[PDB]
Amino acid sequence: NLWVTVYYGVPVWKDAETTLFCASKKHNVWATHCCVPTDPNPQEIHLENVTEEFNMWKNNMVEQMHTDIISLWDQSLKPCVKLTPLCVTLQCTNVTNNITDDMRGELKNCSFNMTTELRDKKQKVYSLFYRLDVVQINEYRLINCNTSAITQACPKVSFEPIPIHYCAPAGFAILKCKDKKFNGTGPCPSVSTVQCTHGIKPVVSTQLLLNGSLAEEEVMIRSENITNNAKNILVQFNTPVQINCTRPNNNTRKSIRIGPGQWFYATGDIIGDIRQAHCNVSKATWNETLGKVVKQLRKHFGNNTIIRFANSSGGDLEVTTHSFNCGGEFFYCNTSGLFNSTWISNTSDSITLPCRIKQIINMWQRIGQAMYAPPIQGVIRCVSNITGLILTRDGGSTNSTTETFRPGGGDMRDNWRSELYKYKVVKIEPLGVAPTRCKR
Amino acid sequence: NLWVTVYYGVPVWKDAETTLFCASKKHNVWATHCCVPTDPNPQEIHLENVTEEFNMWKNNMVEQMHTDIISLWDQSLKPCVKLTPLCVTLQCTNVTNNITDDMRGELKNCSFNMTTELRDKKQKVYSLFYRLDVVQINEYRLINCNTSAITQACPKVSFEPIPIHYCAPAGFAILKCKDKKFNGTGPCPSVSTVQCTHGIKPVVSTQLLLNGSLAEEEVMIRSENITNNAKNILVQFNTPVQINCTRPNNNTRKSIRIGPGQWFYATGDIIGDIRQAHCNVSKATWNETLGKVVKQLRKHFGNNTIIRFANSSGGDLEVTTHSFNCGGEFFYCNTSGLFNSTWISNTSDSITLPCRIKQIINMWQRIGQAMYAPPIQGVIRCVSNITGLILTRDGGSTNSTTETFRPGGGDMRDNWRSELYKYKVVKIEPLGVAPTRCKR
Amino acid sequence: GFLGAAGSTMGAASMTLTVQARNLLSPECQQHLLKLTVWGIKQLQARVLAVERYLRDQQLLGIWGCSGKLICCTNVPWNSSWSNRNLSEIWDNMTWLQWDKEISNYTQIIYGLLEESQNQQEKNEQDLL
Amino acid sequence: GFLGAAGSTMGAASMTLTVQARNLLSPECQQHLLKLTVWGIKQLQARVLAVERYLRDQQLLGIWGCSGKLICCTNVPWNSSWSNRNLSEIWDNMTWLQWDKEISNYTQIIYGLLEESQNQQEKNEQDLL
Amino acid sequence: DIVMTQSPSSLSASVGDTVTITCRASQDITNDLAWYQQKPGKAPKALIYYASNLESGVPSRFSGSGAGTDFTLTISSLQPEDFALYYCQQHNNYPLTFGPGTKVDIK
Amino acid sequence: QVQLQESGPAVVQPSETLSLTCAVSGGSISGGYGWTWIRQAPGKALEWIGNIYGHSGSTNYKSSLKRRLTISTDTSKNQFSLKLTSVTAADTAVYYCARWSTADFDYWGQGVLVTVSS
Ligand SMILES: *[C@@H]1O[C@H](CO)[C@@H](O[C@@H]2O[C@H](CO)[C@@H](O[C@@H]3O[C@H](CO[C@H]4O[C@H](CO)[C@@H](O)[C@H](O)[C@@H]4O)[C@@H](O)[C@H](O[C@H]4O[C@H](CO)[C@@H](O)[C@H](O)[C@@H]4O[C@H]4O[C@H](CO)[C@@H](O)[C@H](O)[C@@H]4O)[C@@H]3O)[C@H](O)[C@H]2NC(C)=O)[C@H](O)[C@H]1NC(C)=O
Ligand SMILES: *[C@@H]1O[C@H](CO)[C@@H](O[C@@H]2O[C@H](CO)[C@@H](O[C@@H]3O[C@H](CO[C@H]4O[C@H](CO)[C@@H](O)[C@H](O)[C@@H]4O)[C@@H](O)[C@H](O[C@H]4O[C@H](CO)[C@@H](O)[C@H](O)[C@@H]4O[C@H]4O[C@H](CO)[C@@H](O)[C@H](O)[C@@H]4O)[C@@H]3O)[C@H](O)[C@H]2NC(C)=O)[C@H](O)[C@H]1NC(C)=O
Ligand SMILES: *[C@@H]1O[C@H](CO)[C@@H](O[C@@H]2O[C@H](CO)[C@@H](O[C@@H]3O[C@H](CO)[C@@H](O)[C@H](O)[C@@H]3O)[C@H](O)[C@H]2NC(C)=O)[C@H](O)[C@H]1NC(C)=O
Ligand SMILES: *[C@@H]1O[C@H](CO)[C@@H](O[C@@H]2O[C@H](CO)[C@@H](O[C@@H]3O[C@H](CO)[C@@H](O)[C@H](O)[C@@H]3O)[C@H](O)[C@H]2NC(C)=O)[C@H](O)[C@H]1NC(C)=O
Ligand SMILES: *[C@@H]1O[C@H](CO)[C@@H](O[C@@H]2O[C@H](CO)[C@@H](O)[C@H](O)[C@H]2NC(C)=O)[C@H](O)[C@H]1NC(C)=O
Ligand SMILES: *[C@@H]1O[C@H](CO)[C@@H](O[C@@H]2O[C@H](CO)[C@@H](O)[C@H](O)[C@H]2NC(C)=O)[C@H](O)[C@H]1NC(C)=O
Ligand SMILES: *[C@@H]1O[C@H](CO)[C@@H](O[C@@H]2O[C@H](CO)[C@@H](O)[C@H](O)[C@H]2NC(C)=O)[C@H](O)[C@H]1NC(C)=O
Ligand SMILES: *[C@@H]1O[C@H](CO)[C@@H](O[C@@H]2O[C@H](CO)[C@@H](O)[C@H](O)[C@H]2NC(C)=O)[C@H](O)[C@H]1NC(C)=O
Ligand SMILES: *[C@@H]1O[C@H](CO)[C@@H](O[C@@H]2O[C@H](CO)[C@@H](O)[C@H](O)[C@H]2NC(C)=O)[C@H](O)[C@H]1NC(C)=O
Ligand SMILES: *[C@@H]1O[C@H](CO)[C@@H](O[C@@H]2O[C@H](CO)[C@@H](O)[C@H](O)[C@H]2NC(C)=O)[C@H](O)[C@H]1NC(C)=O
Ligand SMILES: *[C@@H]1O[C@H](CO)[C@@H](O[C@@H]2O[C@H](CO)[C@@H](O)[C@H](O)[C@H]2NC(C)=O)[C@H](O)[C@H]1NC(C)=O
Ligand SMILES: *[C@@H]1O[C@H](CO)[C@@H](O[C@@H]2O[C@H](CO)[C@@H](O)[C@H](O)[C@H]2NC(C)=O)[C@H](O)[C@H]1NC(C)=O
Ligand SMILES: *[C@@H]1O[C@H](CO)[C@@H](O[C@@H]2O[C@H](CO)[C@@H](O)[C@H](O)[C@H]2NC(C)=O)[C@H](O)[C@H]1NC(C)=O
Ligand SMILES: *[C@@H]1O[C@H](CO)[C@@H](O)[C@H](O)[C@H]1NC(C)=O
Ligand SMILES: *[C@@H]1O[C@H](CO)[C@@H](O)[C@H](O)[C@H]1NC(C)=O
Ligand SMILES: *[C@@H]1O[C@H](CO)[C@@H](O)[C@H](O)[C@H]1NC(C)=O
Ligand SMILES: *[C@@H]1O[C@H](CO)[C@@H](O)[C@H](O)[C@H]1NC(C)=O
Ligand SMILES: *[C@@H]1O[C@H](CO)[C@@H](O)[C@H](O)[C@H]1NC(C)=O
Ligand SMILES: *[C@@H]1O[C@H](CO)[C@@H](O)[C@H](O)[C@H]1NC(C)=O
Ligand SMILES: *[C@@H]1O[C@H](CO)[C@@H](O)[C@H](O)[C@H]1NC(C)=O
Ligand SMILES: *[C@@H]1O[C@H](CO)[C@@H](O)[C@H](O)[C@H]1NC(C)=O
Ligand SMILES: *[C@@H]1O[C@H](CO)[C@@H](O)[C@H](O)[C@H]1NC(C)=O
Ligand SMILES: *[C@@H]1O[C@H](CO)[C@@H](O)[C@H](O)[C@H]1NC(C)=O
Ligand SMILES: *[C@@H]1O[C@H](CO)[C@@H](O)[C@H](O)[C@H]1NC(C)=O
């Protein structure tokens, strides 16, 4: 009665593992990396029914970003100065002039014998340094000399985190989950097809997620496994928290020719008082925000248990502090002033976070490399949107006494999956068969 | 009566010049070079008749291996240390302690001023060296300084000669010659088609071919031109000869930081007695083996002529000695003890070959480069299968007195064609015509 | 399962055309080829060339009016100069390898004639309507 | 032998379609392009793009039911707004270069109509059986 | 198959005589010929290989030569212990093939 | 050096299987040699039967016997053997074993005279 009939152009698909294009300043690395334009993207096609299954914890788009962002970064800064010759014994004293007390011992004033453009002459030069980049001998040396020759990031390369969009290649499509409050896994009932994702800013940070998207309705707490203390908990806020960060001290920059076309940028004398870098977080806003987080958090905890927030104890700066880059400088701020509370499970104007900065930055774990950010002249003023948090559980024996929770670090994948959870890529499979009542 | 009719998918082919895929440890270069899996390869299709013409002396698969193996080698070791700074005047004495007589003057003990990680400090270090790598001034210098800055092979890169298979790309096929005792050229009557060849171990050596395949029936002697003394003779054995090589002396290794992330591996003091490296070849086995070789060799020589084997006279180590790499070290063994005989043309327990080793190895002729193999700690024990030989004729005037034959070197192509002689690659040509009694 | 017909008579082998034609388009390396990219170049060149060859065969079948099916009659008389042989002498007794050699030097003659046969056929249909 | 028809009237040039269509797929460098591989990239890009263009033309002919042959009637009425001209005014007097300009802005109109004509034709055949 | 023949089928000789026999191939076998000495009651002794090379244990009086299809076995100074049957065989291809043999008798 | 020695039935009846074993001493069965069976029919010239290699099998048989003839080895006894099924009167011969090397048979056994008879 029926014979095989072949149908081509059948609207079906399978899970894909593919490479997305990227789509979009002169100096900005992402601006020059992907020129593929995007903006006129009312290309979203609602799919009735479907109910596609998503799993953000296995999302290979996150993995792609990790690989490509690191590559772009390294490629962009590979052809710069390579300040191997800066790794010499330094003669240092502390900067002790127009300073505050919180800066005592923070800055060093070091002199050294630097090469000149001629391979027979040396010059006496000096630079100010942050103590976090300089290690005492038994005289001082730069800390990186233990593992790596370092470079100098090019002053003409911009890492402003302009948003980029990802687009699927022909034969592939991206399924977007529109299920409001989708936790991150399972049968998303409302999906649409796009060729290109919305723009995501490639912002690098620990503890606090900055300038990402906000939840459409209510604060969302998600994790791969909420009962596993080995897993991170990602929290998306439905409102931003305003954070104002600054680097006081009007700095200047020297330019030293160390070789035939090789310039090194030293930190020169500071104009005005020397003060500590810091961030200001609205007190009330933060309070309200965590109140919402705990009210949601309680979904997975015992009745009237007591929940606390605590100091980010751990072994390093990328573990215990809030790292970020703004104004071109790398900040390591102390967030213990934020994560300090008890919610009682029955309760009824600016937190200042002291902050330090560094120039010799490894970026992504690693043993060697490191980019020596050059000095920035003048002062830095940054205002950001805290859009989310990364936290962990203690996982101890339970005798009431719920986790005191700590913010923490991790690799960059967790700062992207927080956005990428909405997308899945599938392969289109247009060829298939069905029985039909026909013959040639 | 007949009209041209076009047939597509016609089972015909032409000789091809193409690129094969390679198919297969963490550190092994071939393991990481080609991940393309192979094992389930009962893909051999017997072809009745055909009688394909082969010519191993023109086999472009051999040429491909030469090019790709060298490239892989260089690529694998390119990103290592680059020990340019080791090329300094050395202060040396001989090692004279727990030694034997055959090692007198073999090892040097040299001290020098090496750089440290800071570009202002030096350190006094020393290393033991083999005399073959060190040349006396008028004090000593490393021998390579005459032509090349050298590198240090990475300790994490493995060159264990794991076998690899080659596979043809779509549109091509490999014809395997199954004619037992095929000499290497002409109308092979029994062939089959494979997509992938069997695995071949990329073993590097001179004089004696190690760990290759054995002849299916009897010893095979083949050459491009048996009457041309300018050509090499390849001999495939039908039985292996066991060779046991060792490097005595329990060595240790130092690790010297010469720069910011640059480590040099020096040879430290030797534990126990210092003895000469050597190889043990079964006496009887060797005798039987050459007896078989000469009985076959006589096919191309005058009646009852007298055939001899002789010392590999020539101008260099890669010419006169048996070079190989085992345990990570490069050996140069004296084979004059093997190639010493007269067969009379009427005739009715361990040969020890003294052997020396080197670290500064050029690998493939060349003028410069060279990889400085790092030291291996402890001792080395290797057991290999001698599977074949490379020999040459003298070609002098004939007054009876046949060649006294000598083993010798050459480039790597001859160590591969010995296996590759079985394969040819052809291009598939599916489109063709013939007359047929039909019209549209 | 692939070239076993290459020795069969041309006639017998006409039943395996599918067998050979169907093989024409036949992690870790994923990262290896993105480094030391000369290897990536070699792989891309191989893939591209396979495609180009495939398309040229399809283009020839297209131009001759033989796109679709493995066997087509083209109405060009066989010139018994290209091969002055009987069908019982070639289809029943020769293999395709032998045949390809037998008329290798007429390949271009026949192909030009095939293109024109098709040109005339298309013209005639358009002229009819 | 290639573009000499580009000035002939469209009618006369209809006999050279084969001449132009047949050219679409038309050592040492072998080693040079494997070094300084940016050159290899340029060559691969060129080869790939030629293939992509070829395939898109074939895809358009496929979707319109004109895959195979160089000339096909598609049953879409000519709208004498696209070009309110007589056939004696265009086929006999205009060249293809002139014509392409004359109706360049209807290319997309016609193509959409052609796709639907084919969709209806296939539907009708499947509905019949 | 490659067929081997011999001529004469028999030869008469005295001690001290030089005698020869000829082995012929139906196919060119370059030099892949071997000669044997068979005495009544025993398996044959190899004499010559590759048309002309003497085998170990064979007295110097045994020699021979030939190529392609025509080969000769020569026994100089024929000894009383040499009144035996002689055979030739080809090993150029399979089956290995032996000639009919030549019987050498003593006058 | 090497000594070969045949053993087995002197008389086999028609249709039965003849099995002859050639023991090897003075060398190994496993070496790179062609273990070969050869027979000489009474009143006839010597005829090759087939062979097997000590290290590889990879046999060679007279084609006319391939449907009846099997040649194999047993390394535990350092021996090789000839198995011929469906014997007939035409198979009467003295069977010898021999050791083939390169261009000749270096070693021979003594032979077994085998008669095919009810
Ligand atoms: C979350 O999102 C917020 C909002 O976008 C983001 O903060 C913003 O960061 C960017 C980059 O750090 C800030 O942009 C800088 O603003 C200063 C101030 O200029 C003001 O006045 C001009 C006058 O026309 C206005 O146009 C401008 O908008 C401001 O009002 C600029 O000076 C900066 O440009 C310089 O630095 C760039 C670095 O790549 C150079 O490319 C550029 O050419 C400029 O360099 C020149 O001046 C330097 C001064 O010393 C000199 O050294 C150089 O050699 C050269 O001469 C830049 O525009 C923006 O204002 C921030 N927004 C707020 C509200 O503060 C957060 O960072 C983001 N959070 C995270 C974590 O990403
Ligand atoms: C013809 O074919 C033969 C047969 O394969 C081949 O010889 C073989 O060569 C390989 C490589 O040279 C030998 O393998 C080495 O064996 C030693 C001994 O280990 C024994 O005990 C362990 C216990 O579980 C067994 O598993 C093992 O099989 C042995 O019995 C190993 O120690 C070697 O591994 C080390 O070196 C490797 C170098 O690439 C490292 O990758 C590996 O991680 C190990 O390194 C570690 O130890 C080092 C010791 O100082 C240390 O320095 C490193 O930092 C690290 O800690 C390796 O397995 C194999 O035994 C040989 N076979 C025989 C019979 O000897 C011939 O070479 C071949 N001929 C030619 C010319 O190619
Ligand atoms: C970091 O240390 C350096 C090195 O000591 C400090 O620079 C030094 O500053 C003094 C005072 O500004 C300079 O003295 C100058 O002497 C000339 C002599 O005629 C005089 O005319 C000037 O008015 C001035 O007094 C000194 O040369 C200068 N040294 C160098 C190498 O430039 C630097 O200020 C210290 N920075 C901080 C933040 O402490
Ligand atoms: C190669 O030459 C070097 C350089 O001479 C030899 O190393 C030297 O060995 C001696 C004896 O082991 C070391 O002497 C030490 O002195 C201290 C002083 O308190 C003593 O406590 C130790 O017990 C020891 O005697 C000497 O320092 C050392 N030199 C260096 C630079 O390390 C090396 O042993 C020689 N190797 C061979 C194989 O000959
Ligand atoms: C630059 O190099 C000079 C030369 O070595 C250093 O000055 C020497 O310092 C030592 C320390 O005791 C003195 O004994 C020498 O007399 C000094 N020589 C001279 C010429 O000054 C100098 O300190 C180095 N400078 C820096 C900043 O590292
Ligand atoms: C997101 O919410 C869904 C509920 O819609 C969770 O899926 C349920 O998980 C439980 C676990 O045992 C299953 O028993 C239910 O059958 C699941 N429901 C469905 C519809 O499959 C899902 O696990 C949540 N995911 C996250 C990341 O929290
Ligand atoms: C912080 O969040 C606020 C609130 O969403 C952002 O302000 C909005 O920016 C969008 C951009 O087009 C405007 O359409 C909205 O009207 C703005 N809202 C308000 C209340 O003005 C603000 O830009 C965010 N800042 C960062 C750094 O992302
Ligand atoms: C966490 O909260 C506690 C309680 O408010 C803080 O401790 C108090 O800090 C104020 C600051 O002036 C003191 O006056 C109180 O005496 C402190 N309380 C006690 C019991 O000593 C604590 O410092 C907070 N931690 C962080 C990191 O902010
Ligand atoms: C390392 O460098 C020092 C400095 O040049 C060398 O020692 C000098 O050797 C000369 C040789 O006559 C002496 O005159 C100097 O007095 C020595 N100076 C010092 C400070 O020792 C030293 O030999 C070098 N070492 C090596 C191993 O090369
Ligand atoms: C391999 O053996 C073949 C024989 O089968 C050799 O080919 C012969 O070479 C001679 C040289 O003059 C020709 O006269 C014969 O006609 C050839 N025979 C065939 C069948 O063509 C071949 O040369 C040998 N090759 C090697 C490498 O030794
Ligand atoms: C080649 O063979 C000759 C002959 O056996 C070797 O010379 C003999 O070596 C032994 C070793 O103890 C001596 O006792 C003999 O006196 C030597 N013979 C003569 C005539 O001197 C020769 O050494 C061998 N060559 C090699 C490289 O092994
Ligand atoms: C290869 O040649 C053989 C003959 O040498 C061909 O064998 C034919 O097989 C068919 C099968 O039924 C027989 O009917 C023919 O009589 C055989 N030929 C002869 C001469 O007997 C074989 O077909 C040829 N090629 C292939 C690929 O099979
Ligand atoms: C280019 O223009 C010329 C006229 O200027 C065309 O020439 C025509 O050639 C045919 C050939 O038989 C004549 O019959 C016509 O009368 C000629 N035209 C005129 C106006 O005389 C020519 O064909 C045009 N283009 C090409 C490509 O040939
Ligand atoms: C520099 O810092 C160290 C750190 O303890 C301090 O002891 C020393 O007194 C400081 N020097 C000056 C000049 O303040
Ligand atoms: C330098 O490396 C050594 C290696 O163990 C380490 O102990 C030391 O602490 C490192 N220096 C610094 C400043 O950490
Ligand atoms: C950040 O600066 C803006 C500037 O108007 C201000 O309104 C906002 O309150 C500041 N936020 C904090 C936390 O001080
Ligand atoms: C935050 O909540 C705690 C809860 O007791 C309260 O004491 C504190 O004053 C609150 N802070 C703000 C800024 O409202
Ligand atoms: C809720 O309270 C009761 C009171 O005894 C307690 O036993 C129970 O374990 C609590 N539930 C959880 C999940 O902690
Ligand atoms: C923040 O400063 C406080 C001051 O007492 C210190 O105890 C805490 O460990 C610091 N935390 C971090 C993350 O630096
Ligand atoms: C070092 O080797 C040379 C080489 O002949 C030798 O003359 C010298 O005596 C040796 N030195 C020692 C200490 O043995
Ligand atoms: C160094 O190079 C020169 C160049 O002719 C050569 O003569 C000398 O022998 C070389 N050194 C060694 C140790 O061979
Ligand atoms: C090599 O070592 C093995 C280990 O058992 C041994 O049997 C063999 O005889 C040795 N070969 C030689 C030549 O010593
Ligand atoms: C190798 O053959 C020669 C030939 O005369 C012999 O003298 C020698 O003893 C033989 N060696 C062995 C190990 O049998
Ligand atoms: C074989 O021996 C004879 C004896 O004189 C000699 O003339 C002949 O040249 C030899 N054959 C060869 C090929 O040497």
Chains in contact with D, where contact requires at least 3 CB pairs less than 8 Å apart: A, C
By C-alpha distance, the chain F residue nearest B285 is F31
Distance in Å from the first CA to the final CA of chain E: 36
Beta carbons of B142 and B360 less than 8 angstroms apart:
yes
Please return the burial class of E94, using the count of CB atoms within 10 Å of its CB with bins 0-12, 13-18 and 19+: middle
One-letter amino acid of E96: L
Atom 1 in ligand 22: residue holding the nearest Cα: B244
Q: Where are the alpha helices (DSSP H) in C2-106?
A: 17-21, 29-32, 38-64, 87-90, 96-102
Pick from D8, D92, D99 the residue to mutate for probing ligand 13's pocket: most ligand atoms within 8 Å of its CB: D8
Instruction: Give the best residue of F3, F6, F46 to mutate against chain E (max E CB count within 10 A).
Output: F46
Say how many residues make up chain C: 129
What is the distance in A from the centroid of ligand 22 to the CA of B285? Answer: 12
Distance between CA atoms of residues B376 and B325, nearest Å: 12
- Residue B69 in tokens: 């193996």
Pick from B287, B293, B343, B347 the residue to mutate for probing ligand 23's pocket: most ligand atoms within 8 Å of its CB: B287
Please return the burial class of A217, using the count of CB atoms within 10 Å of its CB with bins 0-12, 13-18 and 19+: exposed
Query: How far off is chain E from F22, nearest CA to CA, in Å?
Result: 14
What is the distance in A from the centroid of ligand 22 to the CA of B242? Answer: 7
DSSP codes of every residue in B105-162:
TTEEEEEEEEE-SSTT-EEEEEEEEEGGGEEE---EEEGGGGT-------TT-B----
Distance between CA atoms of residues B436 and B1, nearest Å: 8
What is the distance in A from the centroid of ligand 21 to the CA of B144? Answer: 10
Domain count for chain F: 1
Query: How far off is chain B from C99, nearest CA to CA, in Å?
Result: 8
Rounded to 5°, the CA angle D26-C123-D94 comes to 80
**DSSP label at B378?**
E
One-letter amino acid of E54: L
Preceding amide of E95 cis, omega within 30:
yes
What is the distance in A from the centroid of ligand 8 to the CA of A353? Answer: 14
Neighbours of A65 (CB within 10 A): 24
Query: How far off is chain E from F17, nearest CA to CA, in Å?
Result: 23
3-class secondary-structure state, position F93: strand
Chains in contact with C, where contact requires at least 3 CB pairs less than 8 Å apart: B, D
Query: How far off is chain F from B219, nearest CA to CA, in Å?
Result: 8
Are the beta carbons of B10 and C77 separated by less than 8 Å? Answer: no
CA dist C87 → B45, C83, C91, D19 (Å): 29, 10, 5, 34
- State whether the beta carbon of D97 lies less than 6 angstroms from ligand 13: no
Q: Which of F102, F90, F93, F76 is nearest to F39 (CA)?
A: F93
State how far Cα A414 lies from the chain centre. Answer: 9
Domain span at residue F10 reads 1-118
Distance between CA atoms of residues A145 and A86, nearest Å: 9
Instruction: Give the best residue of B115, B120, B123 to mutate against chain A (max A CB count within 10 A).
Output: B120
Domain span at residue E10 reads 1-107
State how far Cα A97 lies from the chain centre. Answer: 36
Beta carbons of B269 and B195 less than 8 angstroms apart:
no
Q: Which residues contact A134 (CB under 8 A, 6 or more apart)?
A: A90, A92, A108, A110, A140, A141, A142, A143
Beta carbons of A11 and A427 less than 8 angstroms apart:
no
Beta carbons of B359 and B330 less than 8 angstroms apart:
yes
Say if D123 is an interface residue toward chain C (CB within 8 Å): no
One-letter amino acid of A244: N
What is the distance in A from the centroid of ligand 3 to the CA of A269? Answer: 10
Are the beta carbons of B4 and C2 separated by less than 8 Å? Answer: no
Total CB pairs under 8 A between chain A and D: 5
CB-CB neighbors (< 8 A) of A437 in chain D = 129
Q: Which position has the token pair 């191997």?
A: A84
Beta carbons of B354 and B101 less than 8 angstroms apart:
no
Cα atoms in the 13 Å half-sphere on the side-chain side of D71: 20
3-state helix, strand, coil in chain E (%, to 5): 5, 50, 50
Provide the greatest CA pair distance for chain E: 38
Total CB pairs under 8 A between chain C and D: 50
Distance between CA atoms of residues A326 and A332, nearest Å: 11
What is the distance in A from the centroid of ligand 24 to the CA of B345? Answer: 14
Q: Which residues contact D62 (CB under 8 A, 6 or more apart)?
A: none
Q: Which of C48, C59, C67 sits opposite D48 (nearest CB)?
A: C48
Distance between CA atoms of residues B240 and B233, nearest Å: 18
Ligand whose nearest atom lies closest to the CA of B48: 12
Domain count for chain C: 1
Query: How far off is chain E from B305, nearest CA to CA, in Å?
Result: 8
Q: How was this structure determined?
A: cryo-EM
Q: Specify the ligand 10 atom closest to the Cα of B224.
A: 27
Q: Which of D14, D40, D71 sits opposite C41 (nearest CB)?
A: D40
Q: Which residues contact F95 (CB under 8 A, 6 or more apart)?
A: F6, F20, F37, F38, F39, F49, F82, F111, F112, F113, F114
Beta carbons of D64 and D74 less than 8 angstroms apart:
yes
Domain count for chain E: 1
Q: How many angstroms is the resolution? A: 3.9
By C-alpha distance, the chain B residue nearest C30 is B35
3-class secondary-structure state, position C114: helix
Total CB pairs under 8 A between chain B and E: 24
- Residue B16 in tokens: 């091809």
**Beta pairing partners, B322:** B333
One-letter amino acid of B39: D
3-state helix, strand, coil in chain D (%, to 5): 60, 0, 40
φ, ψ for residue A346, nearest 5 deg: -175, 75
Distance between CA atoms of residues B266 and B253, nearest Å: 6
φ, ψ for residue C31, nearest 5 deg: -95, -35
Q: Which of A60, A206, A73, A175 is nearest to A426 (CA)?
A: A175
Domain span at residue D57 reads 1-129
Beta carbons of B411 and B302 less than 8 angstroms apart:
no
Q: Specify the ligand 13 atom closest to the Cα of D5.
A: 27
CA dist E70 → A435, E5, E31, E106, F46 (Å): 75, 10, 10, 26, 20
Check contact B-E (3+ Cβ pairs < 8 Å).
yes
Q: Using CA atoms in the order B271, B273, B277, B280, what is the torsion angle rounded to 10 degrees?
A: -120
Q: Which residues contact B279 (CB under 8 A, 6 or more apart)?
A: B243, B244, B245, B246, B322, B331, B333, B352, B353, B355
Pick from B242, B384, B386 the residue to mutate for probing ligand 2's pocket: most ligand atoms within 8 Å of its CB: B384
What is the distance in A from the centroid of ligand 14 to the CA of A143? Answer: 19
Are the beta carbons of B119 and A147 separated by less than 8 Å? Answer: no
Instruction: Give chain A's radius of gyration (CA, Å).
Output: 26
One-letter amino acid of E62: F
Q: Which of E55, E95, E100 sits opposite F62 (nearest CB)?
A: E95
Taking a contact as any Cβ pair under 8 Å apart, which residues of chain D between 97 and 126 contact chain A? 126
